Structure formats: structure tokens, C-alpha cells
Amino acid sequence: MNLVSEKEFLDLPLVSVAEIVRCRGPKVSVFPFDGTRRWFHLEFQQAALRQSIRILKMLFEHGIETVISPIFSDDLLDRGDRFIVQALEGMALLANDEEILSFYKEHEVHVLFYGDYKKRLPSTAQGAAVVKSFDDLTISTSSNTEHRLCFGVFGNDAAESVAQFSISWNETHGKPPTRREIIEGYYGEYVDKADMFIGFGRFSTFDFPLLSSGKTSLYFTVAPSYYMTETTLRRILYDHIYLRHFRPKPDYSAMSADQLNVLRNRYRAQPDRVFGVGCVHDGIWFAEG
Amino acid sequence: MNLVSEKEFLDLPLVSVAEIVRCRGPKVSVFPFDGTRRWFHLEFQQAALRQSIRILKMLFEHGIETVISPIFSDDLLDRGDRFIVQALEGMALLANDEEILSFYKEHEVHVLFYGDYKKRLPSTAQGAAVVKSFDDLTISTSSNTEHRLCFGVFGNDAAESVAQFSISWNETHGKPPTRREIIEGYYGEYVDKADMFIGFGRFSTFDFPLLSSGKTSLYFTVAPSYYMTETTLRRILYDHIYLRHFRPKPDYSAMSADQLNVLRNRYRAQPDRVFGVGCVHDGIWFAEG
Numbered sequence A, B: 001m002n003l004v005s006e007k008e009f010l011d012l013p014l015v016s017v018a019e020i021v022r023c024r025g026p027k028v029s030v031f032p033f034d035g036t037r038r039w040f041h042l043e044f045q046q047a048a049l050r051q052s053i054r055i056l057k058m059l060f061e062h063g064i065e066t067v068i069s070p071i072f073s074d075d076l077l078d079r080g081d082r083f084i085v086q087a088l089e090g091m092a093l094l095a096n097d098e099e100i101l102s103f104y105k106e107h108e109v110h111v112l113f114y115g116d117y118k119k120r121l122p123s124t125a126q127g128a129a130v131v132k133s134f135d136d137l138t139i140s141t142s143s144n145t146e147h148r149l150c151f152g153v154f155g156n157d158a159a160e161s162v163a164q165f166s167i168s169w170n171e172t173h174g175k176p177p178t179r180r181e182i183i184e185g186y187y188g189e190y191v192d193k194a195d196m197f198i199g200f201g202r203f204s205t206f207d208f209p210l211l212s213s214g215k216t217s218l219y220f221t222v223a224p225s226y227y228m229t230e231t232t233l234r235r236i237l238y239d240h241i242y243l244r245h246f247r248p249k250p251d252y253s254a255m256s257a258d259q260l261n262v263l264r265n266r267y268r269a270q271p272d273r274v275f276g277v278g279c280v281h282d283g284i285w286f287a288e289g
């Protein structure tokens, strides 16, 4: 269990990997769907929906219980009117399309939505329809317990929301809410800290307030989210589960004088080595090294 | 100004780089001091203090206005009693040592402290001394306006703190606090979102609640924080300022059929390329690729 080689891990059947993940984690994984337009212009609503389902299905079939997936951020008013409509149409799909609803039922997925969407969403018919669809879905899938899916819609800044939720909670309860109750209030249900975040391109994380910690393993694929392969996910999983927090930890004092020199050389050999710096090609940033 | 080459940027005098940063940013930079014991066991309280000052001085002399530096996290009770004492002694240095106090006065630095240190700090003499020292320093350097320095002591989970701060604010004010007021309450003064985070080793961020956004450029050096060189910082600065958000943005539609193929190849050439996966050597994780 604690002694599986990366090669074996990569050769293992899906049901075997899932069992390992159910026991070792990650329990909660953040996976935003970025670089969609780019992916489309290389390989719309019905195409992205399929890929989203593919990846989401992939994540859940690997044992991951909860998936936090940011889909819409405030940077949505940075585009025309046709975007708003098209956007709300995509949001509607998440709660109305038959193939995805079957996905929730097939894999018993409880869908929840977080963010400042109720306020920031265009105060109009189509917008209210989405909100109602979101609430409806959340309750519809309440019976599902195998997996939890959290969609981020304007879920980048929780400060004000937490503040107002705490004030109301204190007014009706008589005491301030616990961290647990604060999280249930934002995500609609309790969710453990994120164990990993899988982004792409520029090194940056976003849209998963209150669930971040120094223990959230970060990963940045070179290609867009939808390009995620089976091999890539397993390599990410393996790294997090067996490599990030290695044990027994290092004992500097008990090491020989040579081991220390070899270690020091690993750092001073390339004294200015940095991960995060990139280069631009056609306006697109690519990580170096 | 908007057309400086990386080479020139690297050749430019310090006062020139600072001027560019004062105009283009980053305005707020997160720089935690990690891998200290490791650095020490390769090159204690008086040694780390010097390096911390070196780097802090480096950051400020490059134009950075605010530096958020996490120094102590809850993972402090993961060690013996001698650690607690030694730790509170280091904390005391930040507010009592003469060379660092001169540093604040020399570079006009306003020092602030954030985190759940008032509660979690050992309810004892030495602990209360630190807390008082912290409050004292914060007020002592209130006249300084050139730079702002925020030290993170148990500043990983702000949820409960924000909740209680909002309840009290609403009770005395009659209305909930704004995001701005919520941030002033946690950090003791208003601070803009973090423009970049410079970590090391394992890809992960931490201890800068409420100040994170998708625009927080992440960087992970291979060697410990104290190994930070002049060249490395400039390469990081340059990347953030001129490369992260390149402009004009890309126009897929207006590109030739070949440019699109070259771009697609940049992604499918190495289909499973991932940044964040590593390898272990002597219990120490090192990023691959």
C-alpha cells in the first residue's frame, strides 16, 4: 500500500488506483476548466461540455471524492453581451442537459454551486432561471453520496460573503459560527481543505476560498485543461500521494559529510534556477526550464 | 518603459529597476522564509536574521512597496519545548534587535503582524512579551510610509477571525464591514491583493489570507529562500511585469493556418508535460523537468 512503485501505479487497473486514492487521498481536488477557447481553436458549448464530463468522470473514477471546479469568474464582464448569454447557456447546461444529469445519477454526484453568482448574475429572466436551476440541482442530487462536485461561479472573493453570513448566523444563533459552519455556509456543505490544484499555463491558483493551505499540492500542465490524459493524472496523483510528504523526513545531523555536499551541489550547481518564469509565443505564455 | 528588454533589465542599475517597479509593480509581494534549517546546515537566530534582512532589503530596494512574509505557522507545535522558546526569541528579534530596527528606520518600514498569534501564542510571560512587542512595533513604525512589512504568525486560516471581526463591527457600526475594512482588520491596515508569491521547493502557497487572486504570479525557486540572488529576483520581476500579462492578447482567428499548427505542436509535442511533479533525494523533494 505505502510501497507501490510509480511504474506499477501507472500499470495498475483503474479500480486499483481508485482504491489507493480512497485510502491515501487526495480527498479534495481543485480542477478549473481553463484554455477552453484555445482548445476549441485547435481540436463549442456541446464540445466543452463533453470534455468537462470526460475529465470530471476521470477524476471521480480515480477515487477523488470531491472536485472543486471554478468555471466562471468576475472576469466575465470583460467581454460583450453575446458572452453573457452564451455563458448563462453554459451554466444552464450544467443543471439541465440530459447527458450530464445522467452523469450525476450514474456516478452518484452531489452538485453544489459557490460564489457571488446570486448577486453578480445579470438581474434578468435568464439569470434568475440559472439561479433557480442551481438551487434545484443542489437539492436534486442531495441523495447522492459517492461524489461531491462544486462549481465556482464568481467564487473568487469570499470575504464580504463570510462577513454577512457570520453576522446573520450570530444574530439568529447568539454565537459566531465555527470555521466548519462558515465553510458549510459558503459551499453549501462542509468540504475539507483542497489536497491539490491542477492548473495550466501561467503558475497561478484561484477560486477556491477558505479551502487552501500549504498542503494544497500545486500542479501546472503545459497544455489546456481538456488535454488532460490518463498518464498525466496518475503522475500527478502519484507525486502528491507518495512524494510531496515523504517519510521518514530528512535527518541532516545523521548524514555523512559527502551526502551533505551532494545535496548542497544540487542547489548551488544551478544557483539561479527558478520555476515560474516563462517566455511568450504568439501572446501565449509558456513556462521555461 | 513598456519596451525594456530582459537583458537591459538585468543590466540596469538598482535605482532604475526600482523606478520601473514603482510604476509597473508588483506593489505587493509575498515572500515566506522557508528552508532555514536546511540553509543553516549547508552554509542560527543571528544568521537567519541577517539573511532575512538581506532579502527584505533587496525586495524593498527594488521598488516593492509591501512585502507579506509568513514566518510562523500552526505547524510550530509539531516540535519540542526548546522550539517554542527559540521561536519566541526569533519573534522578539523582529521587534527588539537594533540592526533590524535600524533597517526599519533606514528604509522607513511600517511593520505589521497578522495571524492568530494572540490566541495561539503560549499563554505565558514570554508569549505576552512578544505580543506587546508586536503591538508596540506596529505603532512605532506608523510614521514610516516608504514600505510596509507584514509578518505572518499563525496567519493561515482567517475564516474564524473574519467572522468574529465582522460580528463586532456590525454590532458597533450597525452595518457589515466592506471587504476593505475586513482586510484592514486582519492585517491592521489595507493591503492590495498579492501580485506575486515567491516560494521554494514543493509547489505550494500559504499564509496570506484574503490577498490571493488568479493574478498572483507564482514562482518556486529550487534552492532555499535565503539563497535568493539578485539575478533570480530580476528574472522573476521581469517575468511578472512583462510576460505574465502580455498585450495585445492573442487573436486566434486572425492567425495563419501554420501559426496555429506550430502552436498546437507546442502542446502535443510533449502531451503529458507537467510542472509540479518531482523526485525525492534524501527525503528532499525536487521539481522535475
Ligand SMILES: C/C(=C\COP(=O)(O)OP(=O)(O)O)CC[C@@]1(C)[C@@H]2CCCC(C)(C)C2=CC[C@@H]1C
Pocket: A033, A034, A035, A036, A037, A038, A039, A044, A045, A048, A049, A050, A052, A071, A072, A073, A086, A087, A090, A091, A093, A094
Ligand atoms: C470562462 C469561459 C471562457 C474563458 O476562456 P479561457 O479560460 O480564458 O481560455 P482562453 O484563454 O484559451 O480563451 C466560458 C466557460 C464555458 C466555455 C464553460 C467551460 C466549462 C463548463 C461548460 C458549461 C461546458 C462551459 C460551456 C460554455 C462556456 C462558454
Ligand SMILES: C/C(=C\COP(=O)(O)OP(=O)(O)O)CC[C@@]1(C)[C@@H]2CCCC(C)(C)C2=CC[C@@H]1C
Pocket: B033, B034, B035, B036, B037, B038, B039, B044, B045, B048, B049, B050, B052, B071, B072, B073, B086, B087, B090, B091, B093, B094
Ligand atoms: C518556522 C521555523 C523553522 C521551520 O523550518 P523550515 O521552513 O521547515 O525549513 P526546513 O524544512 O529546511 O527545516 C523557525 C523560524 C526562524 C528560523 C525565523 C526565520 C525567519 C525570521 C527569523 C526571526 C530570523 C527567524 C529566527 C529564528 C526562527 C527559529
